[PDB]
From Swiss-Prot:
It comes from Cryphonectria parasitica. Its EC number is 3.4.23.22. Keywords: Aspartyl protease, Disulfide bond, Hydrolase, Protease, Signal, Zymogen. This is Endothiapepsin. It catalyses: Hydrolysis of proteins with specificity similar to that of pepsin A, prefers hydrophobic residues at P1 and P1', but does not cleave 14-Ala-|-Leu-15 in the B chain of insulin or Z-Glu-Tyr. Clots milk. The keyword Oxidoreductase does not apply. The gene is EAPA. One of its GO terms (biological process) is proteolysis. The active site is at D35, S199. Residues 17-328 form the Peptidase A1 domain. GO terms for molecular function: aspartic-type endopeptidase activity. Belongs to the peptidase A1 family. It comes from the Eukaryota. Disulfide bonds join C255-C290. The keyword ATP-binding does not apply.
Length: 330
Protein backbone atom coordinates (compact mmCIF):
# COMPACT_ATOMS: atom_id res chain seq x y z
CA UNK A 1 0.00 0.00 0.00
CA UNK A 2 0.86 3.68 -0.24
CA UNK A 3 -0.52 7.04 0.86
CA UNK A 4 -0.11 10.60 -0.39
CA UNK A 5 -1.38 13.75 1.32
CA UNK A 6 -0.89 17.45 0.76
CA UNK A 7 0.56 19.48 3.61
CA UNK A 8 -0.23 23.19 3.83
CA UNK A 9 1.43 26.07 5.73
CA UNK A 10 -0.74 27.40 8.56
CA UNK A 11 0.19 31.03 7.90
CA UNK A 12 2.19 33.35 5.66
CA UNK A 13 5.45 32.60 7.50
CA UNK A 14 5.32 28.77 7.26
CA UNK A 15 5.25 28.58 11.07
CA UNK A 16 3.98 24.99 10.77
CA UNK A 17 2.27 22.71 8.27
CA UNK A 18 -1.07 20.89 8.55
CA UNK A 19 -2.11 17.68 6.82
CA UNK A 20 -5.68 16.32 6.75
CA UNK A 21 -6.16 13.01 8.58
CA UNK A 22 -9.31 10.84 8.63
CA UNK A 23 -10.14 9.35 12.04
CA UNK A 24 -12.98 7.00 12.90
CA UNK A 25 -16.11 5.69 11.21
CA UNK A 26 -17.66 7.64 9.63
CA UNK A 27 -14.52 9.66 9.00
CA UNK A 28 -13.80 12.71 11.10
CA UNK A 29 -11.20 14.82 9.32
CA UNK A 30 -8.74 16.73 11.50
CA UNK A 31 -5.79 18.83 10.35
CA UNK A 32 -2.70 17.53 12.13
CA UNK A 33 0.90 18.75 12.43
CA UNK A 34 3.10 15.89 11.21
CA UNK A 35 6.06 15.88 13.58
CA UNK A 36 9.18 13.78 12.91
CA UNK A 37 10.48 14.96 16.31
CA UNK A 38 7.83 13.23 18.47
CA UNK A 39 5.90 9.98 18.57
CA UNK A 40 2.37 10.64 19.83
CA UNK A 41 -0.74 11.02 17.67
CA UNK A 42 -2.95 13.29 19.76
CA UNK A 43 -6.05 15.31 18.98
CA UNK A 44 -8.34 18.00 20.29
CA UNK A 45 -11.47 16.11 21.28
CA UNK A 46 -14.89 16.17 22.89
CA UNK A 47 -12.99 15.46 26.13
CA UNK A 48 -10.79 18.58 25.92
CA UNK A 49 -11.43 21.17 28.65
CA UNK A 50 -13.91 23.54 27.01
CA UNK A 51 -12.04 26.75 27.88
CA UNK A 52 -8.96 25.32 26.13
CA UNK A 53 -10.69 24.83 22.77
CA UNK A 54 -10.80 27.92 20.50
CA UNK A 55 -11.69 27.12 16.90
CA UNK A 56 -10.10 23.68 16.49
CA UNK A 57 -11.93 20.76 14.97
CA UNK A 58 -12.45 18.02 17.58
CA UNK A 59 -12.52 14.24 17.47
CA UNK A 60 -15.62 12.82 19.15
CA UNK A 61 -14.99 9.13 19.80
CA UNK A 62 -18.60 8.46 20.83
CA UNK A 63 -19.60 9.22 17.21
CA UNK A 64 -17.18 6.66 15.79
CA UNK A 65 -18.40 3.07 15.53
CA UNK A 66 -14.80 1.82 15.41
CA UNK A 67 -13.49 3.75 18.46
CA UNK A 68 -12.56 1.71 21.53
CA UNK A 69 -11.34 3.12 24.84
CA UNK A 70 -7.87 1.75 25.62
CA UNK A 71 -8.58 0.84 29.20
CA UNK A 72 -6.33 2.43 31.78
CA UNK A 73 -4.09 4.22 29.29
CA UNK A 74 -3.03 7.85 29.73
CA UNK A 75 -0.53 10.13 28.02
CA UNK A 76 1.30 13.36 28.79
CA UNK A 77 3.85 15.14 26.64
CA UNK A 78 6.04 18.25 26.85
CA UNK A 79 7.64 19.74 23.75
CA UNK A 80 10.88 21.66 23.24
CA UNK A 81 9.07 24.98 22.91
CA UNK A 82 7.56 24.47 26.37
CA UNK A 83 4.07 23.52 25.18
CA UNK A 84 2.24 20.45 26.52
CA UNK A 85 -0.89 18.28 26.42
CA UNK A 86 -2.29 15.17 28.13
CA UNK A 87 -5.31 12.88 28.25
CA UNK A 88 -6.57 9.36 27.65
CA UNK A 89 -6.43 6.97 24.70
CA UNK A 90 -8.67 5.32 22.15
CA UNK A 91 -7.90 2.96 19.32
CA UNK A 92 -9.56 3.76 16.01
CA UNK A 93 -9.13 3.65 12.26
CA UNK A 94 -6.82 6.36 10.92
CA UNK A 95 -6.20 7.14 7.24
CA UNK A 96 -3.68 9.49 5.66
CA UNK A 97 -3.86 10.20 1.95
CA UNK A 98 -5.56 6.87 1.21
CA UNK A 99 -3.38 4.76 3.54
CA UNK A 100 -5.40 3.16 6.35
CA UNK A 101 -4.27 1.81 9.73
CA UNK A 102 -6.75 -0.01 11.94
CA UNK A 103 -6.23 -0.06 15.70
CA UNK A 104 -4.16 3.12 15.78
CA UNK A 105 -3.75 4.73 19.19
CA UNK A 106 -5.51 8.08 19.05
CA UNK A 107 -4.58 10.10 22.11
CA UNK A 108 -7.50 12.29 23.17
CA UNK A 109 -6.53 15.54 24.88
CA UNK A 110 -8.16 16.37 28.21
CA UNK A 111 -5.79 19.32 28.66
CA UNK A 112 -3.68 21.43 26.30
CA UNK A 113 -1.34 24.35 27.01
CA UNK A 114 -2.09 27.90 25.93
CA UNK A 115 -0.05 27.85 22.72
CA UNK A 116 -2.17 24.97 21.40
CA UNK A 117 -5.43 26.69 22.35
CA UNK A 118 -4.27 29.91 20.70
CA UNK A 119 -3.53 28.19 17.39
CA UNK A 120 -6.93 27.51 15.82
CA UNK A 121 -5.40 25.90 12.71
CA UNK A 122 -3.80 22.85 14.37
CA UNK A 123 -6.18 20.12 15.54
CA UNK A 124 -3.43 17.91 16.98
CA UNK A 125 -0.09 16.24 16.18
CA UNK A 126 0.86 13.08 14.33
CA UNK A 127 4.24 11.86 15.55
CA UNK A 128 6.69 10.29 13.12
CA UNK A 129 9.81 9.83 15.29
CA UNK A 130 10.57 6.39 16.74
CA UNK A 131 7.95 4.64 18.87
CA UNK A 132 10.36 4.43 21.80
CA UNK A 133 9.44 8.10 22.51
CA UNK A 134 5.69 7.47 22.70
CA UNK A 135 4.32 8.68 26.03
CA UNK A 136 1.34 6.33 26.53
CA UNK A 137 1.36 4.61 29.93
CA UNK A 138 1.36 1.87 31.11
CA UNK A 139 1.55 0.29 27.63
CA UNK A 140 3.57 2.30 25.11
CA UNK A 141 1.92 2.64 21.70
CA UNK A 142 3.22 2.63 18.12
CA UNK A 143 3.27 5.52 15.65
CA UNK A 144 1.12 5.61 12.54
CA UNK A 145 4.22 4.88 10.43
CA UNK A 146 5.27 1.95 12.61
CA UNK A 147 1.78 0.45 12.36
CA UNK A 148 1.62 0.94 8.57
CA UNK A 149 5.17 -0.14 7.81
CA UNK A 150 4.71 -3.82 7.09
CA UNK A 151 1.87 -3.07 4.66
CA UNK A 152 3.75 -0.38 2.74
CA UNK A 153 5.28 -1.10 -0.68
CA UNK A 154 8.57 0.19 0.78
CA UNK A 155 9.17 1.02 4.48
CA UNK A 156 9.62 4.76 3.93
CA UNK A 157 7.89 8.09 4.14
CA UNK A 158 8.96 11.34 2.46
CA UNK A 159 8.60 15.00 3.40
CA UNK A 160 8.40 17.59 0.63
CA UNK A 161 7.59 20.86 2.40
CA UNK A 162 6.87 23.98 0.39
CA UNK A 163 8.18 27.51 0.80
CA UNK A 164 5.09 29.70 1.18
CA UNK A 165 3.24 26.93 -0.69
CA UNK A 166 1.70 23.49 -0.21
CA UNK A 167 3.80 20.33 -0.29
CA UNK A 168 3.44 16.58 0.17
CA UNK A 169 3.89 13.71 2.62
CA UNK A 170 4.10 10.33 0.90
CA UNK A 171 4.06 6.91 2.57
CA UNK A 172 5.43 3.74 1.04
CA UNK A 173 7.06 5.11 -2.13
CA UNK A 174 9.58 7.62 -3.46
CA UNK A 175 8.18 10.00 -6.10
CA UNK A 176 11.09 10.25 -8.52
CA UNK A 177 9.49 13.29 -10.21
CA UNK A 178 9.57 15.33 -6.98
CA UNK A 179 13.31 16.08 -6.84
CA UNK A 180 16.28 16.93 -9.01
CA UNK A 181 19.55 15.01 -9.26
CA UNK A 182 20.12 12.13 -6.86
CA UNK A 183 19.09 11.39 -3.29
CA UNK A 184 22.07 11.22 -0.93
CA UNK A 185 21.59 8.89 2.01
CA UNK A 186 23.25 9.31 5.38
CA UNK A 187 23.38 7.30 8.62
CA UNK A 188 20.81 7.64 11.41
CA UNK A 189 21.17 7.05 15.14
CA UNK A 190 17.96 6.05 16.88
CA UNK A 191 19.59 6.15 20.35
CA UNK A 192 17.58 9.23 21.43
CA UNK A 193 14.42 8.20 19.53
CA UNK A 194 14.93 10.83 16.80
CA UNK A 195 15.89 10.89 13.12
CA UNK A 196 19.38 11.90 14.24
CA UNK A 197 22.14 12.33 11.65
CA UNK A 198 25.44 14.18 11.09
CA UNK A 199 25.77 16.96 8.54
CA UNK A 200 29.18 17.29 6.93
CA UNK A 201 29.39 21.08 7.16
CA UNK A 202 28.10 24.42 5.95
CA UNK A 203 28.59 27.52 3.82
CA UNK A 204 27.24 31.07 4.15
CA UNK A 205 26.16 32.67 0.89
CA UNK A 206 28.83 32.31 -1.79
CA UNK A 207 31.48 31.60 0.86
CA UNK A 208 33.74 28.58 1.09
CA UNK A 209 32.34 25.35 2.50
CA UNK A 210 33.48 24.54 6.03
CA UNK A 211 33.89 20.81 6.61
CA UNK A 212 32.73 20.06 10.14
CA UNK A 213 30.46 17.42 11.68
CA UNK A 214 27.13 18.74 12.95
CA UNK A 215 24.97 16.17 14.72
CA UNK A 216 21.28 17.03 14.73
CA UNK A 217 17.72 15.86 14.14
CA UNK A 218 15.44 16.10 11.11
CA UNK A 219 12.35 17.63 12.73
CA UNK A 220 9.32 18.63 10.66
CA UNK A 221 7.62 19.84 13.85
CA UNK A 222 10.16 22.58 14.53
CA UNK A 223 9.89 25.79 12.48
CA UNK A 224 13.46 27.04 12.45
CA UNK A 225 17.01 25.82 11.93
CA UNK A 226 18.90 25.56 15.24
CA UNK A 227 22.68 25.15 14.98
CA UNK A 228 25.81 25.68 17.12
CA UNK A 229 26.55 29.27 18.17
CA UNK A 230 29.74 29.40 16.09
CA UNK A 231 27.85 28.51 12.88
CA UNK A 232 24.98 30.90 13.60
CA UNK A 233 27.34 33.79 14.42
CA UNK A 234 29.16 33.20 11.12
CA UNK A 235 25.82 33.42 9.23
CA UNK A 236 24.50 36.60 10.86
CA UNK A 237 27.89 38.34 10.58
CA UNK A 238 27.14 38.53 6.84
CA UNK A 239 23.96 40.57 7.44
CA UNK A 240 24.52 44.28 8.16
CA UNK A 241 22.82 45.28 11.37
CA UNK A 242 21.99 41.77 12.53
CA UNK A 243 22.34 41.09 16.23
CA UNK A 244 21.37 38.62 18.92
CA UNK A 245 18.65 40.12 21.11
CA UNK A 246 18.07 38.57 24.54
CA UNK A 247 14.83 40.57 24.86
CA UNK A 248 13.40 39.17 21.62
CA UNK A 249 14.90 35.71 22.11
CA UNK A 250 17.33 35.33 19.24
CA UNK A 251 18.94 36.89 16.21
CA UNK A 252 17.09 39.76 14.58
CA UNK A 253 18.00 41.73 11.48
CA UNK A 254 16.86 44.87 9.64
CA UNK A 255 13.80 44.03 7.56
CA UNK A 256 15.45 46.02 4.72
CA UNK A 257 18.25 43.43 4.42
CA UNK A 258 18.79 40.93 1.64
CA UNK A 259 19.66 37.66 3.38
CA UNK A 260 22.41 35.33 2.12
CA UNK A 261 21.72 31.67 1.47
CA UNK A 262 22.87 28.92 3.83
CA UNK A 263 24.21 25.61 2.59
CA UNK A 264 24.40 22.39 4.62
CA UNK A 265 26.25 19.19 3.75
CA UNK A 266 24.77 15.73 3.39
CA UNK A 267 27.75 13.52 2.75
CA UNK A 268 29.47 14.97 -0.31
CA UNK A 269 26.16 16.58 -1.42
CA UNK A 270 24.94 20.09 -0.64
CA UNK A 271 21.49 21.53 0.13
CA UNK A 272 21.07 25.27 -0.40
CA UNK A 273 18.56 27.19 1.70
CA UNK A 274 17.73 30.43 -0.14
CA UNK A 275 18.06 33.63 1.89
CA UNK A 276 14.33 34.36 1.70
CA UNK A 277 13.59 31.10 3.59
CA UNK A 278 15.44 32.57 6.59
CA UNK A 279 13.15 35.64 6.88
CA UNK A 280 10.47 35.26 9.57
CA UNK A 281 9.23 38.80 9.32
CA UNK A 282 8.68 41.64 11.78
CA UNK A 283 9.17 40.75 15.45
CA UNK A 284 5.89 42.57 16.18
CA UNK A 285 3.35 44.10 13.83
CA UNK A 286 4.79 47.19 12.12
CA UNK A 287 8.35 46.68 13.36
CA UNK A 288 11.32 47.12 11.05
CA UNK A 289 13.24 44.49 13.03
CA UNK A 290 12.77 41.02 11.55
CA UNK A 291 13.23 37.62 13.17
CA UNK A 292 15.85 35.24 11.84
CA UNK A 293 15.20 31.70 10.68
CA UNK A 294 18.61 30.41 11.78
CA UNK A 295 19.10 30.47 15.56
CA UNK A 296 21.52 29.11 18.15
CA UNK A 297 20.91 25.65 19.61
CA UNK A 298 23.03 26.53 22.64
CA UNK A 299 21.02 25.50 25.67
CA UNK A 300 18.57 23.37 23.65
CA UNK A 301 21.04 20.53 23.97
CA UNK A 302 20.62 19.37 20.38
CA UNK A 303 20.89 20.82 16.88
CA UNK A 304 17.60 20.83 14.97
CA UNK A 305 17.16 20.71 11.20
CA UNK A 306 13.63 22.12 11.30
CA UNK A 307 11.35 23.31 8.51
CA UNK A 308 13.71 26.10 7.34
CA UNK A 309 16.22 23.40 6.35
CA UNK A 310 13.88 20.59 5.39
CA UNK A 311 11.72 22.67 3.04
CA UNK A 312 14.84 23.26 0.86
CA UNK A 313 14.99 19.48 0.19
CA UNK A 314 13.09 16.35 -0.70
CA UNK A 315 13.63 14.23 2.41
CA UNK A 316 13.40 10.44 2.69
CA UNK A 317 12.75 8.92 6.12
CA UNK A 318 13.84 5.34 5.50
CA UNK A 319 12.44 3.00 8.13
CA UNK A 320 14.23 -0.14 7.00
CA UNK A 321 15.70 -2.41 9.68
CA UNK A 322 18.66 -0.03 9.81
CA UNK A 323 17.06 3.38 9.31
CA UNK A 324 18.66 6.07 7.13
CA UNK A 325 17.83 9.59 5.91
CA UNK A 326 17.98 10.76 2.31
CA UNK A 327 18.20 14.33 0.99
CA UNK A 328 17.80 15.64 -2.56
CA UNK A 329 17.60 19.10 -4.04
CA UNK A 330 14.31 20.02 -5.72
Amino acid sequence: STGSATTTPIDSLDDAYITPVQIGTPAQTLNLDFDTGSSDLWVFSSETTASEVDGQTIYTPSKSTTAKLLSGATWSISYGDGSSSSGDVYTDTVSVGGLTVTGQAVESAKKVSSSFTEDSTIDGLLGLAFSTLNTVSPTQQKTFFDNAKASLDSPVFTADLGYHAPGTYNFGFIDTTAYTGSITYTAVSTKQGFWEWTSTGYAVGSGTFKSTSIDGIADTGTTLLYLPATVVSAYWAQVSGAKSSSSVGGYVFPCSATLPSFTFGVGSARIVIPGDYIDFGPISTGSSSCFGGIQSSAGIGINIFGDVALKAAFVVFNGATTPTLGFASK
